[PDB]
Every structure is written in C-alpha cells, then in structure tokens.
Design a protein around this ligand. Structure first.
Ligand code: HEM
Length: 153
C-alpha cells in the first residue's frame, strides 16, 4: 500500500506527463519495443515497424501511446482504488491480447526510464521509488486477475 506522501510524488510527476501525453507514449512504446522485441510481436498493429525512425514516424503508434497512458493515468489517479479500471484491462490483456505479466514489468521499466529522462527535477530517487511502488501495485492487482482467469503462468 502506498502512503499519501508516495502517491503525491507519483501524481506530481504524472501531472508533468500530461503536458505531452503523446510524446511520452511514443518514447515509452519505442523503448519497450527496442529493449524487449518480443513485445512488438504482440501487436499485429505495429509489427511491420522495423526501425526506430519508422516507429517515431507512425501516427497510429503515437495514437496508441495516448490510449495507453490515458488508461494508466486514470488508474494512478485512483491511488490504489482502481478495481473498476483493472477488470477490463486485465481481461483484455490476459485473454485477448495474450500479454504475460512479465511484459507489464517491461513497460513499467520503460515508463520509469522515460519519466526520468523528461522530468529529472520531479523524478529524483524518492519519486522513482514511489512510481515503482505504484507500478508494482498495478502489476500485483492485474496478476491476481490473470490468476483468476488461468493466465498467471
Ligand atoms: C501500463 C500498461 C498498459 C496499459 C495501461 C495498457 C492499456 C491498453 C489499452 C487502454 C488498450 C485498448 C483497450 C484494450 O484492449 O484493453 C490496449 C490495447 C492493447 N495492448 Fe495494452 N496496455 C498496457 C500494456 C501492454 C503491454 C506491455 C503490451 C504488449 C507487450 C500490450 C499490448 C496490447 C495490445 C496488443 C493491444 C491491442 C492493440 C490493437 O491492436 O489495437 N499492452 N492496451
């Protein structure tokens, strides 16, 4: 469970992200795909992209980055009271998109890295640890739903 002070660190940096949701979403998905190419293969929508320049030029990838970060921002702003938001996300990601929990760890690392690059003054070690806790809580709660449905592994 995050403390109130931890949540404030998380949402303080997240308010900075929302100034350029689309740029963040591009950086995050590109980092994910580059660092963990098995993740790109899960997207029929994106798997034609073979270079970082092609990824950066894709408007559809930029659009999806906004979809992803909007859903995550809505979860973070619930400060842990996010059951209604995780149900459908866990259901689609386990049963339709077939995304292992480990890949959620990978995108969590990408999010932390890009927040660090873009917001160093609001993403010192305290805020990095708090965002890591928030993303762990996200993964923990999604993993419990995957387990329910027979997909935790
Ligand atoms: C912070 C973590 C994530 C969030 C908040 C998120 C959010 C979303 C949302 C809101 C959608 C559209 C609605 C839906 O299908 O549920 C979506 C679609 C999808 N997501 Fe995620 N996602 C996350 C992580 C991942 C990861 C790590 C992968 C793959 C490695 C992935 C793969 C997909 C795929 C394949 C789709 C469908 C894309 C399409 O063809 O339109 N997601 N995601």
């Amino acid at each position: 469970v995050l403390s109130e002070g931890e949540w404030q660190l998380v949402l303080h940096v997240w308010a900075k992200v929302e100034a350029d949701v689309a740029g963040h979403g591009q950086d995050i998905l590109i980092r994910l795909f580059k660092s963990h190419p098995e993740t790109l293969e899960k997207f029929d929508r994106f798997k034609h992209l073979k270079t970082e320049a092609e990824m950066k030029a894709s408007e559809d990838l930029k659009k999806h980055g906004v979809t992803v970060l909007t859903a995550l921002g809505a979860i973070l702003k619930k400060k842990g009271h996010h059951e209604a938001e995780l149900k459908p996300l866990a259901q689609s990601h386990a049963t339709k998109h077939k995304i292992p929990i480990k890949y959620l760890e990978f995108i969590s690392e990408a999010i932390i890295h890009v927040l660090h690059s873009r917001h160093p003054g609001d993403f010192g070690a305290d805020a990095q640890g708090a965002m890591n806790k928030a993303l762990e809580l996200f993964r923990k709660d999604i993993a419990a739903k995957y387990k329910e449905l027979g997909y935790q592994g």
